[PDB]
């Protein structure tokens, strides 16, 4: 698998 | 029944006293589509958006010439649906050392408009 992304956290947080 | 058996210990997660912890949601393809951090905002702990991203890098971080914990979890979880590391360590933005650990459950939901999906929790020792 790919580990998350910094912008893939941020959205996880985000919403 | 079956199906709500399913959902009891993951409701037990989102709410131990006493216990530091986050749950993700991830796809089957490894995915992460949610985060719950509930009872990391209830514990009124300031601190907790770093605690979490140092504790998902560490994760998913190559354990030396092996692979991440995330990947040896994620294969073993889509093959026997159920999996668990050792506990991982990691440095928060003030210095502290902490572990963690991370158990994981793939779970079929009951209704047909859903794709079966990871159960994860991620507890600080």
């Excluded at chain 1, 790919?2 to 919403?15: I, R, V």
Aim: charged share 20%.
């Amino acid at each position: 698998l790919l580990p998350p992304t910094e912008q893939d956290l941020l959205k996880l947080a985000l919403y | 029944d079956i199906f709500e058996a399913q959902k009891i210990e993951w409701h037990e997660g989102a709410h131990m006293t006493g216990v530091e912890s986050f749950m993700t949601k991830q796809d089957t393809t490894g995915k992460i589509i949610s985060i719950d951090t509930s009872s990391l905002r209830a514990a009124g702990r300031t601190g907790w958006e770093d605690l979490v991203r140092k504790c998902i890098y560490a994760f998913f971080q190559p354990q030396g010439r092996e692979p991440s914990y995330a990947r040896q979890l994620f294969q073993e979880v889509m093959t026997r649906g159920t999996a668990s590391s050792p506990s991982y360590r990691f440095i928060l933005n003030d210095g502290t050392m902490l572990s963690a650990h991370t158990k994981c459950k793939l779970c079929y939901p009951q209704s047909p408009d859903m794709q079966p999906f990871i159960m994860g929790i991620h507890i600080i020792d």
